[PDB]
Each structure stands twice: as C-alpha cells, then as structure tokens.
Design a protein around this ligand. Structure first.
Ligand code: ATP
Ligand code: ATP
Ligand code: ATP
Lengths: 523, 523, 273, 525
C-alpha cells in the first residue's frame, strides 16, 4: 500500500494530538472525583465505565498518525491492566505528561535518546525508592481500604472483599459474577483453580473480557491423549444430547482434529471448550483424580482400561459454572458429593502427613489449600444491566488491587508516594546535562497523578501540588473530603505493584516513543 | 494495463524524489544518535524500530515513479540485510549520495555508463583497500564492542553476546527469542542446527520475519521417502490429537500430496511443517539418527522395517522450541534424554577416533561441534511489547554483526575506515574523463556515512568530515561523546564484511540505476 | 498592489520559459531565409514583418515571471539596437543559447557566479580576438554590399549609401528624406549637427519615425535656462503670427516650461521642438 | 473595514513565515558574492539590483499576517539604513536568525520576555565588546578601502571621497554633484549646512534622489511663523517675475501656507522649497544672520518689525546651488561676499573668546567651523547619464558609510567582527535558564552573516565559519578572492557604527516581535 510518510515535527505533532485525545479520554476517570465515560457498543446498550483500560482500547482516531499514537498509548493501558488490573489511568497520565514534556524539549533541539536514558535512570531510581518506601499490607483493614479506594471510595465492596480474603485467606481465589437481586452478595462455594488457559482464541465468548463462561458445564477429564476423533465422538454425541456444555481437561489439545471441525460442525448455540492440565505425570494424574472427585467424574487412563466410548453422562463430572481465562482457569462450583469431597480432603491430608519430600509436601499443601479455600463468588447486585457491568468493573478493580497489595505492599494513595520519591530523587544526575534534563522531565512528570486527580475534583492543581511538595512522609491531599492529612490514617493507599508497574511501563513506552521521527502509514 | 511512459529528466526527478523519501526515512536511524521510526501495522500495535531494512520494506509511494525509485532502493537494504544483517542504513545512504551526485552529473550531460564503469572501478579498488585494512576480530572484547555498537551503544547486550560466543565458541549458534521477565537472559541449552530451509513459502507464520516458530513441536524423522498419504495419515492422525505441532524432516518434501490438502484440511489452528534433511546417504542417515536421539525419537528405514503406521506418539521425537528459516533450520531445545545425548556424543567421539579419512573426520568433527556447542537462547526481557520487538531487533543486529565480524574482520567504526580508504583512492583514474568523474562521484559519496551520523547528532557535518580527512589511521569522531579520537581504542568498529557488502551493493545498484532514461508504469 | 515572490530553481526555469518564447519568436526571422512573422493590430490588417526589433517589441506574456524574463531579453535586444542598429536577432539568439546552457549548468549544481566570471572571461577573449580578426571597411564597395545586406539585400540602398559616403567623405553626415520623383535624389548642402535630444518624447511628430521632422522652421538660439514660459510667451506669439514650426536651443529647460510646451503641443496650436 | 485577529502560536508562525520570505529575498544579495535580484516594474524593463534596500522596499505579501511580519523587518531595515546608510542586508539577516531561533525557543514553552531580556543583555554585551574591538578609521588608506567596498568594490569612488576629506579635514561637509566631463571633478567652496528638512515631502523634485536639488535659487531668511500665504504672495510674485527656484527658511510654517505651497508646486508655476529655522532663540537668530551674510540675504523677524510682505528681490539671499536633504539643507557657492563671511567669522570667534557657558561656546565653535571650513563638492564623471546617476548613488551611500566610520571607528569587514565578538562572549550567563537560552540565541544568531556570505560564495558556510572561529584576531575569509587571510591587509573593512546599529535595531525589533501574541489585521476583501 502507498505510504504517507511524515518526518520530524509534523509526525510528532500528529502523534501528540492523538495521544492527547486518548489521555484526556482516560484521565477524565481518575481519582475519587473521577467521572465515568460512555463507550458505544453496536450490538447492545451503551457501556458506562470508570475502567480506564477498556476505554483506552476503544479509542481509534480517524487521522492515521493520531491513530498510531493512540494505539501506542493504548499499549500502556493494556500492559498495565494485564500486570496489575489497576492504575492504567495513572500509567496513561504519566505517559501523556512524559511525552508532552519530552516533545517540548525535543522541539527546543534536545537529543531524544539522552532523554530516554535519563528517564530510565530516574524511573529505576524511583522503583528502588518505592521498594524502600513500600509497607506490607495486612490487618484486613488496609485490604478493605485498598478495595474501597480502588472502587471509587465504595466502602461496601471493600468490606465485602475484606471478608472474602478473611475467609479464603490472603491467597484464596475470588470470582466476580453477575448478581440477581439489588444487593451484592458473597457466596463462598466449593470450587477449584488451576493455572492454565484456553488452547485457541476462537473460544472467546460474546463478552470481550477474554474469559469464556459456561452455563452449567459438563466436565470431562483425561491424562492420556486420545488418538482418533471416533473414540471421543460418542462422548460428544452423549454431550450433544446431554443438555450441558462440555469442558474437556487434557494434557494438550490440538487444533486440527478438534477445533476446525467443531467450528465447522457447530454454529455456536452451546459452546464446547478444551483446556490444558497443569503439571505432569503423577502430579497431573493426582490433580485430575481430585478434580474428578470434586465434580463427581472419573479420569480415563490406559492402566484402568475404562474408555471414552464406555463413558456415560453420569460417569463424567459436572459443574454449576466454569469461567476460563488465558492466565488461569477456575471451576466455580462443582457439586459432586460433599462427603466424597471431604473424604478426598482427608485422604490428601494423610498424604501430606506421610510425605516428607519438600517438593511433594509443598505440592500436596498447594492441593489442600486449593481444596480448603474454595471459591468466593461476588454476586453484583444492582438495578440495571448498565449498573450490573459498572459495579462489576469497580468490584473487579478492587479485587485486583487487593491482590496486588497483598502480593507486594502498599504506599500512600493519590500519587503522594510519587511526590515523596520525586522529592527524594531531586539529586539524581545523568551522564551529561542532557540526561539531567531527561531526569528533570521525569521529575516534572511524577506529580501528574495528583494534579489530574485535583483537576477532576475541579480544584486548581498547582496549589495542591506545591502544598504536598511542602509536606513530608504520608501527608497529602484527600480529594474526597477536600482536605490535607495523612492518607495512612485515613486509608487512601495504593498497592506498590500497581504504582511501580504503571510508572515502569509509562517510562519505557514514552522513552521509546519520543524518539520517533519518521512515521509511515497508509494514505 | 495502459502505460504512462516518462523519458529523461522528468522521469529521473520523479525517481529521485521517491528515492530521497525512502533514504531520509532510513537515514534518520543511523548512528548512536540515530533516532527510531514508527511503522504502522494494521493487525496489531505500531512498530517502533531502529532496524533500517524493515523501514525500507514498508515504504511505498503514491506516485508510481516515486514508488519505483523506493522499491529499487529497498532492494539495496534487502540484499544487504540478507548478506550481513547490518549496515542496511549505510548501504541506503551510500546509494542516495551516489544517485544524487550521478544525477547531477547526468543533468550536466555526462555519459551514464562510463560513470557506471568509473563507479565500479572505484568500488572494487575500495574493496581491495578495505581487505588490506581489515583487522581480525578476537579477544571477546572486540566482539563485545561490535555487539554493543551494533545495538546502538548498548553495553549489556554486548557483554551478553560476548559471554555467549565465549561459551558456544566463535561458530556456535545463538537464538534470540521473546523473554518473560524485565531482564534479558542467556540460556545455553541442548539443540541442533542444520543448513536447511522450508520447502514452501506458505509455511510463513504471522510474523513477517520469514522464520516460522513452533510452540512445543513434535519431531518426525525419515530417510526413505514414503509413497502414499495413507501411510503417513495415522502419524498425522496421532499428531492430530497428540497436542503438539508436527515438524517432519525428510530428504525432499513434495507439494502436491502434502501441502495442498494440509492447507485445505486445517485453517491454521496448529501448524504442520516439513523440512529437508542435510547431506545425503550415510551422512544424512547418521544426522537423522543423531537428531532422533537428541529428541528421543526414532528414524524410519526400509532396512529396519518399522513403519509409520506402527509409529506412536512416544516413539517419535519431541522438542521444546523449533524455529525454521529458509537459510538454516534449528531445533532450539530437544529434551530427549541427557544420558542418551551424552552417550551419543561419546559414540560419535569414538567414531572420530576410529575414522581417518579427511572427509569423514571433518564431517564427524562438524557433528561433535554441533552437539557440544548447543544453542544459546536470548530471552529478551523488557517492559512492553514495543520494547520486546525493539530490543529483539537491536539484539539480532548485534548477533549478525558479531557473526560477520568473526567471519571476515573489523575496521574503524562510523565509516572512519571508509573515509581512510576514500583518501587512499584519490589517485585512481578511469579510461576517460567520464570514468574519472564517476570515480570522483564515488569518492565524494563515500563520506556520506560520517556526514549522516554527525547530522543525526545534530552537529556540523562538514567540520567532522574535514577533520577526519585531515586525520589518518584510525583517528575519527566518536559521535556518542562528541569528540575526536581513535575508534579502535574506544571500540567503535564495523565488521569488514558489512561495510564491504553495503558499498558493493550500493555501487552496483546505483551505477546501474543512474543510467535509466525511460520509465514505464501504470497510469 | 501586493507582490508575489518566487525564488529558487523554479524562478530560473520560469524566465527560461520566457526567454525561450521570445527568443524563438524572434529567431525564426534571422538570416536572409528568415521566415515571416505576423503581428496583430488592434485595428485593420495585421502587419507581417521580418524585422527582429518589430516582433521583439510587443512580446509580453500572460503570467508575470516569464513575462519578466521576456522583458529582460527585450531590454538587451533594444540596448544592442540603439548601440548598433542591426543584428538584434543575432544578439537575442546568442542570449538564448548562453542563458539556456548557463541555466542548465547552474541547475546542474555549479557555482553561478563562477560560471558568470568564466563566461565574462571567454567573451572578453572573444572581443579581443574579433578585434584581431576585424577587417577595415574603408572601401566603398564593401560599404555598398553591407548597406545592401542590412536593407534586406537591396543593392539600390547600398549604392546610394556608397555615393553619399563618397560625397561627405569618411566622417560626414548623411540624412534621408522623401523624394516626390520615382528616382532617388542625392544632394550636398551645408548643415549643422549636434548630439542633443528632445526635452520630451511628446515632441516627436511621427511616433513610428522617432524623430521630429520640421520643414522651414524658425530656430531660436539661447545659452540660458528657460525657467518660466513667460520668456517664451512673446516667442510663441510671434511664431503663431508667422505660422511655421519652431525649434528651441537652450542651456536648460525646467519642469514648468517643458510642461507648458507639452500642453501646447497636444493642444495643436504650435509646433515647438 | 472589519478586523480579523489571530492570537497564539499561529500568529507566531505567521510572521515567522513573513520574515523568512523577506529575509531570504534580501539575504540572497548579501556580500560581494551577493546574487542579483530582479524586480518587476509596472512599465518597461524590470530592474535588476544587488541593493538590499531596493529589494526590501517592495516586499509585501498577499496574506495579511506574513505581510505584517515582512513589514516589521522592512521598517527595522530602513531604520538601520537611515541610522547608518549601509549594511541593511546585514541587519535583516541578523533579524532573521534571531527571530527564527527566538520563535523556536518560545514555541518550546519557555518565557518569551525572559528570552527577550537575555537577548537584550547579550546584545548590550556585544555592543560594549565591539566598542572595545573598534579600530579608529583616521587612516586615509582604510577610508579609501571602505569607500571602495561600500560602493560595490569601486576604488575610484573611495579614492575621490578620500581626497574629499583630505580637502575638508576630518569632519567637513561634502556634496556629490553631476559633472559633464567624463573625468571626476573635486572642488572646495565656502558654503552652509544645517540639520533641517522640508516641510512637505512633495517638495522633493526627484523622488528617486530624495533631496531637493536647485540651481541658482533666491533664498529667503525668516525668523517668524508664516501663518498666512498672503505674506508669501509678494515673494511668489517677485520670484515668478525673476524666474528662479525659491527657498524659504522660517521659524514655523502652519498648515495654510504649507498647503498653498504644495498646491503651487503641483501646479508647476513656481519652485518653492521650505525648511524650518535651525537652532533656538538667540543662537538661531545669530546663525540665521550668518546664513544671510553667506547669501547676501536678510533675516525677517516680527520682533524687529520688518515683515515678510515687505520683501524685495535684493533682500532675498542667493547662491549657485542648494541641496535640501530629508532632514538636512546645504548651500554651495553663496553669492555673499567672502570678506563679510570672514568678518562674521571674527565676530563669532570673539564670541567664543567671551563665551562662558560650555553649551553656548560649543554652539559658537560649530558656527565658526561651518562658516570657515566650507563644503567640498565631488562631481561624478562618466559617459552615460544612467551610470552618472548610479555612480552618484554609489558615492552617496559610500560617503555616508564613510561618515559613520569616521564618527565611531572601523573593524574588519565580512562579519568577522561579529564572529570575534561571539567568540569573546561565550562565557556570559543570565539569571535563569530562559535568559541563558536567550543569550545563546543571540550568540548563535550574531554569527549568521559570515555563513550567508559564504553561501553567496558558493562554498560551505559551516566550514568557513568554524575555521574563522578557530582563527584569532582579524583572520578570516576574503569572499572576493575566496581565500583566507587578514582582511585589513587586503582592505576589507566595515564601519563600527553600521554593524553596531544593525545588530542593535535587529535585537530591538526581535525583542518587540518575539513578544507578539495578539495579531489584529483587517479582513480579507
Ligand atoms: N480520597 C482520595 N484522595 C486521594 N486520592 C484518592 C482518593 N480516592 C482515590 N484516590 C486515588 O485514586 C486512584 C484510583 O482511581 P481509579 O481506580 O479510578 O484509577 P487507577 O487506580 O489509576 O486506575 P484504573 O483506570 O485501572 O481504575 C488511586 O491513585 C487512589 O490513590
Ligand atoms: N559512538 C559512535 N561513534 C561513531 N560511530 C558510531 C558510534 N556508534 C555507532 N556508530 C556507527 O553507527 C553505525 C551503526 O548504526 P546502526 O546499527 O543504526 O546502522 P547500520 O549498522 O549502518 O545498519 P542498520 O540499519 O542495519 O542498523 C555503524 O556504522 C557504527 O560504526
Ligand atoms: N571581500 C569581502 N569578503 C568578505 N565579506 C565581504 C567582502 N566585501 C564585503 N563583504 C561584506 O559583505 C557585506 C556587504 O554587502 P552589500 O554590499 O550587499 O551590502 P550591505 O553593506 O550588507 O548592505 P546594503 O543593503 O545597505 O547595501 C558587508 O557585511 C561586508 O562586510
């Protein structure tokens, strides 16, 4: 295709206009005074959201160069949300600040590569500073605060997630799903979780979240890979009139002899899914036995001799709900038999007691933790479908923030930690004055979150920025109550991982992206 | 198609406008102060790169004549990257200089093919001069410098590749692949390398790099060609529900009874690849036996009598990663059995000990070198996908540059050695005054790299060119530290092959290219 | 009126277009086999000429840049004409060749004023060499042939110029008049010549001729400046009573007297030169 | 006519476009290797010139904003011309460099007026540095060289002006005239000069010349205001009966008399040129008495009683020639007796002796200087009237540049003065980063003329610039012979005053137009 090619300042200004559009569209959602935005959906109702990443995904400009810049910054939100699930808006704001100031410097005549290297030096120094300043998160009150603040100062969901992590432990799995009443409910039912994903991206359902859900699925388990379609056709055939969608768990699933002809055979009324089995050998076999007992099913093996053609509907497992994601797949509620589940739990506990090898002990302890923790289910209760998915977004963001906080720790909320590390990093210098200018641009950039939150409050940013810079420790500006105080006392806290990942991704993409002079695109 | 035909100066100026667009878009990436570009991608995120040859590949102009010029100079970068993998930007810059000055001479009325002969005489003299001035590369410090400078003065990757060539020797194979952490990692694992390529260009995966990759492939080996599809259908059928993609190694693979119906069978969910077996007869059989033992597989033969229908999933080989390229195909990691691999290594060593024929000894020594060197794997660790591929590009460029340097030698970096050989060639004269002016055009063109690098630094190109021309030996201008000194001492060195190939390709295409009077295109 | 600028090679190719237009339009008629060129007239029949000056006079192009290039070459052609009297086609043909090759060379990237200096040196050498190659024309026969060739190969004109040349010697003065008879009339009468032009171009009675021809005029001789026309009022009254053309020779003529004389000339009451 | 506004960076880029247009159009002809520029005339042949003033005069753009930018740079060029007389191309080239880097820097988000203050500080330091580096031009050989270079490398003109100052000393008054002979003529005749211009621009007989040149006029001296033209009615009648040009010198001229004189001049019935009365009070009256002695005239005053109406042809002064400049009037070969002039010289010398006030003593000293020194006349000699007037113009601006040189000093030409000063000022800093970048913009802009003239040579600007920077003292690049050396040795010099004024007004207009945010203009119609 014939290419329009732009050089230097023209390319950079088209880039920056597109990036400014996207960053405004995302930054209008930041902070407790953050304001939700409407994303058009052609198939259904318009979607309200405070979730930055879905927004940033939805932007696509008409001018090709502006669109390219917007895609480059959409990468920031995508990477940030995948890493942490929160702070994508923060990452985008840090981006926009860094690109704007770096482009001003470059327009002055600056070398962009030295800016890049200075930005890297400053951002790594900031990573070390936040690691020094990170505080462990505990007491179930800090976690509740993280959830509440993450959900736009929603105390009910913060309390609910605090109760959930109290019950299932700091490492238990919690699932957010559609509720039925007007109230959000907690349902900790028996379930299972294994770190595997779908084999083919054609199993993605109508929702664009990337996780496919099954309405009362039918569980099939296997450790030995079958050979021909005809051996597993009767099971499908039985499934084809069982009533319930089929999820198969195997060591590794092909595309040729399953996916192509299940797509060509079925138009998609009732879905069929196939997933990998984590582990290998005896560990995988024991895990499959545990899953089969949880779902009331059985595991086919060469040694047993029981075959797929002999397998019936009652022999195999069944679950009440199953959600499959690329990162990790969970069976939400497998009915099975409660007495059988308890007997298997006792058997695996005695397996722990007899075992003495460190690897065997730790994997069996992982098994008992998975069985005992269960799955917490969040029934998002609200009046409407728009409020359904909006509250789902805020609840999932709160859950992800709590996860990251217990993974790494917490620091002062509202970007105050950025102010403090910027004050601490004022002395960092680069190889030359060029790298010093880059570090100073990064310094100027890290107060962007506070300024943008205060702007979302309608208050003037520079006043608050200087007021916090005059402060120290955990003194900052509660935007919700429009007053200065200690966040740690009042519970405005960010997870350390969220902040660190956001700043890291933003610095990396911005440093690459301000060094760009030739832009080549279709006309 | 109706042809618009342009003659003489208007044709040549449209040509030159297109060439100038492409050459600017490539030359903005040269040197340590070289600055990255953005190439659009329709399927995914925009690609920020410093790789000049890619920049050449995605340039196409709206005016047909300008598009011709751009394509004919894109040929330069393609040929240069194929030959050496670095210096494509240098080749394009030498082109643009030569075409512009030759067009000025032709606009004066000067005869084109005598200019061509003068250019060839000068460029062959320059080849001999650089061969005289080439210095062998060794000590693992010069290699590290070549890698670092090749990767835009990136010292960490230079140290890493120095360690890699220290471990796997100066001739071992090194693979660059996607990493997982934020850090670039070195993983020297057991693998195989053999100079063979894919049979059909329809096996090219989604990446446009031309090398297909397989995630957990399944290895099949053969020395006797099967006859019918039905004999090898069960293996495929077994593969069709094995879980892993199938790579077949054979003497020579057909298209009629494999490729057509394997494209018609699968839609591209899981790939199936077939490659040629290097060598012939007993050498090919021994290589297949070695590869089957490396992957834990077996080789089908008429003498053995074991048949494809009798072959099972456990009988055949399996690898962790395999990347197939047209030039050379490598199995990155075949698990197999470490004890079996060591036993095969000892057996082949004893085969060396018993053998005395020079050809047998050298091929068995090639076998033991391939087995002992293994495969070095570079896990490109970075924050983002854009930084994934950008760091991959710079690391691969460093790899190719180090390969070329150890293949042929090194000279002064930044074109300083090219300046020196230009100074040494001031006395070369052609058959007539026309050829003399052609030689002088080549002479005035060979200072293009230094000028363009210094311009990328934003500095005064003329003072640097004159200062270096006043200098001698390895005295030149470090662009990174903006100062004049000895390149050998400060480690800025080019591979001799890269520079020689760039100048040869550029001179050939440019002299052949400035002779063009008529241009015939679609309207 | 605002001004539109054009700088760079685009301007150069523009006056190149203009000079090519004018230069071809005038070079067609060069030589004895010079082809006719027809020129429109606002009224009546269009004139048909082989005169390079005549065709070169009215060349003026619609767009301003090539018009201005045509005007520069028109300037040099008329300057050579007033310097020499002939060979204007030759001058502008030489101009076309030199400018075309010069613009080709400067567009080829050489230094323009270095080129100009080289051309100046070459043309100076050509000038001195043509002094070396020059041959005296003191003979009346070559005078007859050159007068013939200049006047469109008319031997009668060259012959008459030869006889007049013999009449007034080497540095005499020859003046053309109109004869009522079908034969040309050659005479020698004492007269006065001095290199002085008219105060105003409006004094010319015949615009095509370019000179003021007066028959039996009263001649006034003055060595003083005519600052006021009141000094010329009795002179005008006397010459109007007598009824003949009037010629004035004075040291200087100021704006007032010149303006009043111009007004009187366009009135049609007196003939004053 | 309605008014359209454009504020913000759009206005900035707009006048940047305008100044780039005009600045290139004038920078092409800079230097001895300056390329020709062709300009259309509404009638006849187009003019071809190397004069920066000429090309800069008729630049105006179709759209209003860049036209305005062109007009600011035009007015600064003309202001420097009237201040100095030469180097207008230099001033506007410096203007282009300073404004382009300044607008680039302000568009980079930093404070424009911090930048302007920094540029002002840097240019003030440059002014004091060039004062330090200025060399006296008392030597007649350097005077001949600078007169040569100013008048397009014509050694004859510089030589003639050199002998002119040899005739009338260091601070004498010299007027160029037209000589009928092919040879140049030089004479010295006692005359008058004073800093007074015409009442109306319509008094100028030659619009291209800009001055009123009159031969053998009747001169009227008055110390009173001409409120009514009825006072000038008998004078007009007498001068119309006599038939010569008329000069009026009066204290003030009101609107009525000026309008009536303008009507009379455009009628074509009389030649009347009126100028103000120079000086003030008793000094003005005394020097008007001196002028009356020089021309044989009489001073008319209301306080004395004798009025403008009671004027005869004998009472008015007379002279052989007069030239009334734009703000100056000079009288050559006055009729009045030299003995009376010598007596007046003695009287004002005794006034000097009895003078006690320094101001009055200096006024009497300049009175005796102008009354005794006289005026040199240089009559240009040539064959053609066209080259007559062209060499006359070359003499005019060459001598004006020579006077600028004599008043202040001379430095090596070719812009290397600016190059050396920029070398000596690399160390100065400002109060913040924006003042520092303003200093840097001024520094790297004041080096532009060398690069532009080398461009005009056809060579590479940067190599010559850095080589001359490396060279120290008066070492630089002869553009004429296109080779290095000392320009003093080969006589390539520029007056200190012209370059100093050029850079001063360039920095002034840059500081004023950098700080342009709102740009109002009339509507496109
Ligand atoms: N009362 C408050 N005072 C100060 N900062 C607050 C307050 N409430 C919330 N914040 C800050 O607002 C941010 C949370 O807002 P929000 O969840 O909308 O965006 P995010 O965490 O940057 O990312 P995302 O777009 O994924 O939601 C955190 O930085 C938190 O510290
Ligand atoms: N500090 C430096 N000083 C001088 N030259 C340098 C310096 N750093 C790098 N170079 C030169 O820059 C070039 C490497 O730049 P780069 O890798 O972008 O381009 P390339 O090698 O010409 O080709 P390609 O487009 O394939 O990368 C080499 O010629 C190297 O000598
Ligand atoms: N031989 C020379 N070598 C180098 N520079 C020279 C030489 N002769 C003159 N110059 C420089 O060239 C400039 C003279 O340019 P030019 O004669 O076109 O007019 P100007 O003085 O710049 O201005 P104006 O427009 O008022 O005529 C001066 O800056 C002078 O120093």
């Amino acid at each position: 295709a014939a290419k329009d090619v732009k050089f230097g300042n023209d390319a950079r200004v088209k880039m920056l206009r597109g990036v400014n559009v996207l960053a405004d569209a995302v930054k209008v959602t930041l902070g407790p005074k953050g304001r939700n935005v409407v994303l058009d959906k052609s198939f259904g109702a318009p979607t309200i959201t405070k979730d930055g990443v879905s927004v940033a995904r939805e932007i696509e400009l008409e001018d090709k160069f502006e669109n390219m810049g917007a895609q480059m910054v959409k990468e920031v939100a995508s990477k940030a949300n995948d890493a942490a699930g929160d702070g994508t808006t923060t990452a985008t704001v840090l981006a926009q600040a860094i690109i704007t100031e770096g482009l001003k410097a470059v327009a002055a005549g600056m070398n962009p590569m030295d800016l890049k290297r200075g930005i890297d030096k400053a951002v790594t120094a900031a990573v070390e500073e936040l690691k020094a300043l990170s505080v462990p998160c505990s007491d179930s009150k800090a976690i509740a605060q993280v959830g509440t603040i993450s959900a736009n100062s929603d105390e009910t969901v913060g309390k609910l997630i605090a109760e959930a992590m109290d019950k299932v432990g700091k490492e238990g799995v919690i699932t957010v799903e559609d509720g039925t009443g007007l109230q959000d409910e907690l349902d900790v039912v028996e379930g299972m979780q294994f770190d595997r994903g779908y084999l083919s991206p054609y199993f993605i359902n109508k929702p664009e979240t990337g996780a496919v859900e099954l309405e009362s699925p039918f569980i099939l388990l296997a450790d030995k890979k079958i050979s021909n379609i005809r051996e597993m056709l009767p099971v499908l055939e039985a499934v084809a009139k069982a009533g319930k969608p089929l999820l198969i768990i195997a060591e590794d699933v092909e595309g040729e002899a399953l996916a192509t002809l299940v797509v060509n055979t079925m138009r998609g009324i009732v879905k069929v899914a196939a997933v990998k089995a984590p582990g290998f050998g005896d560990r995988r076999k024991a895990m499959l036995q545990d899953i089969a007992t949880l779902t009331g099913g059985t595991v086919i093996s060469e040694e047993i001799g029981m075959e797929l053609e002999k397998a019936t509907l009652e022999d195999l497992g069944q679950a009440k709900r199953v959600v499959i994601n690329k990162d990790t797949t969970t069976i939400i509620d497998g009915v099975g038999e409660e007495a059988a589940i308890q007997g298997r739990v006792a058997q695996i506990r005695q397996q722990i007691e007899e075992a003495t090898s460190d690897y065997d002990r730790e994997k069996l302890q992982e098994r008992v933790a998975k069985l005992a923790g269960g799955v917490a289910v969040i029934k998002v209760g609200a009046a409407t479908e728009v409020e359904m998915k909006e509250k789902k977004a805020r609840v999932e963001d709160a859950l992800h923030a709590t996860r990251a906080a217990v993974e790494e720790g917490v620091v002062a909320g509202g970007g105050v930690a950025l102010i403090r590390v910027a004050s601490k990093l004022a002395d960092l210098r680069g190889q030359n004055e060029d790298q010093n200018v880059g570090i100073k641009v990064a310094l100027r950039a890290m107060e962007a979150p506070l300024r943008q939150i205060v702007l979302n409050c309608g208050e003037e940013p520079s006043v608050v920025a200087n007021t916090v810079k005059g402060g120290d420790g955990n003194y900052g500006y509660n935007a919700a109550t429009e007053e200065y105080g200690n966040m740690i006392d009042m519970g405005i806290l960010d997870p350390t991982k969220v902040t660190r990942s956001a700043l890291q991704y933003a610095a990396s993409v911005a440093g690459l992206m301000i060094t760009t002079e030739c832009m080549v695109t279709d006309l």
